[PDB]
Amino acid sequence: PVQASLIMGTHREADLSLKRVKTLLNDKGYQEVITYSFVDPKVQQMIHPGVEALLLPSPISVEMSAMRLSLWTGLLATVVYNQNRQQNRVRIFESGLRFVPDTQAPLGIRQDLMLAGVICGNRYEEHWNLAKETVDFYDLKGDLESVLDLTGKLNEVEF
């Protein structure tokens, strides 16, 4: 075994763990998802029209030739994928980088870590004592307020 020193390193109580936020999203009915960082620019153009994305010369395919400007192309492709398999209710999230061309950013591309998600279908599964109602805006906002409340700064959030 390695013989080395035992030093603690520097902790910061003010840090918010991304894994802690994922745990909350799981406890709110969300499944984690991991999608490809390059997507079909046709689909992404339908979501972010006119926005030029960093394209891959010689890609693995045309449907994987555009670095994602957000996580919504991959997320929305995942619900459609599952809905083609007889699964209407889809509640998923993903963490990952977005790639937005920016001349003021290193390598001319700004790479930000994002937390995104999507919900659809009924609020709950079929239940003898829960009403069948399609999910709405204040359902997703309720989950987002749960996430933002972990910061202790929810009194300063604005929609």
């Binding site: 799981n26 709110k28 009915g29 499944q31 984690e32 509640r91 599964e125 239940h127 004592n129």
Partner: protein, 55 residues
């Protein structure tokens, strides 16, 4: 002996009032038990919750 007669009669009235209270307690506990019986539920029915997700 008239004070002795009034003490025996009031002791009999207290014995009747004790049985009235004991019966009034039996009835209100019988009504509480009837409420408990009507409130029986199937404890095996699924609870209210949203499913847990995973990583």
């Amino acid at each position: 002996e008239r004070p002795a007669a009034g003490a025996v009669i009031n002791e009999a009235k207290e014995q009747v009032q004790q049985a009235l209270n004991a019966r009034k307690a039996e009835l209100e506990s019988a009504a509480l038990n009837a409420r408990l019986a009507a409130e029986t539920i199937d404890v095996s029915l699924p609870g209210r919750r949203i499913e847990n997700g995973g990583l």
